[PDB]
Each structure stands twice: as C-alpha cells, then as structure tokens.
Ligand binder design. Structure first.
Ligand SMILES: CC(=O)Nc1ccc(Nc2ccccc2)cc1
Ligand SMILES: [Zn+2]
Ligand SMILES: [Zn+2]
Ligand SMILES: [Zn+2]
Ligand SMILES: [Zn+2]
Lengths: 70, 69
C-alpha cells in the first residue's frame, strides 16, 4: 500500500544517516575528540586535522562500537 | 499489507537499537573510553564504573553527536 512506501522511505533515510559524511559508503564508526562529532568512517576520519562539522582541532579519533553496526 | 507489518517491525528494531541498553528510555549519546562501547544515554553512563558490554574500566565518558539524533 501507500503506507508500505512511507515506511520504506523512513527506513532508507535512517540507514543513510548512519553512513560516513565524506565517502557516503561506509558506516560511521569514529568520533573526533574532544568535540564529539561522530560522522565519519575510520578511513575518512584518519587524515582530518579539524572537525568537518564544527572546525574544532581533532586531538585524536576514538573508535565507536554501536549496536546498529551491520 | 503483510509487508507494511514487516517494515513496521524493522523500523521498530532499528529505533530500539538506538536506545540506551540500561534504561531503555533515552537515546544512546555516550561512549565509554577507552573501550569504545557506545550503548548508553548520558545518565546511565555517568553511573557505571565498568563497561556493561566488556567490563573494562571506564576512564571517562565521551559525548557523541550523531546524525541520527
Ligand atoms: C558476547 C559477550 O560476552 N559480550 C558481548 C561482546 C560484544 C558485543 N558487541 C557489541 C555490543 C554493543 C554494541 C556493539 C557491539 C556484545 C556483547
Ligand atoms: Zn568515509
Ligand atoms: Zn566537531
Ligand atoms: Zn539510560
Ligand atoms: Zn566496553
């Protein structure tokens, strides 16, 4: 039904929000510290000097294990 | 249809996986450092000396800003 199409769209949007903001291909699994923005996969987070969201200096990257990881 | 029920269940499970594993009421927004397990809201994470997933000592809690929030 049309309700099935609405639910498919909600699911797709939630899944796309879990993907890296730089490569759009890999799941987010890394946090820029100390700001806390968690928006990249490990590879894209590795060479950024400043956070791509808030411009704060990246002192280090913390790996995150999330229950939504697939 | 039956597919509407199946999709409602998938959405419910994905939403529940984003909720705190301790209180089941608030969104996950905190990481136990250094282990990296990110399974609690800030209120439950503040009260745990050891990670509830791996039992490693919590040196500190890092707040996480996620796009799904
Ligand atoms: C099997 C056992 O004794 N404990 C155990 C170990 C790893 C996970 N993995 C995991 C948890 C939360 C978030 C992302 C991954 C869950 C439970
Ligand atoms: Zn990436
Ligand atoms: Zn930031
Ligand atoms: Zn909680
Ligand atoms: Zn842990």
């Amino acid at each position: 039904s049309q309700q099935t199409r609405v639910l498919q769209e909600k699911l797709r949007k939630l899944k796309e929000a879990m993907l890296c903001m730089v490569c759009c291909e890999e799941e987010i699994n890394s946090t820029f510290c100390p700001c806390g923005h968690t928006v990249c996969c490990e590879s894209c987070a590795a060479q950024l000097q400043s956070c791509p969201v808030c411009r704060s200096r990246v002192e280090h990257v913390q790996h995150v294990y999330l229950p939504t990881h697939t």
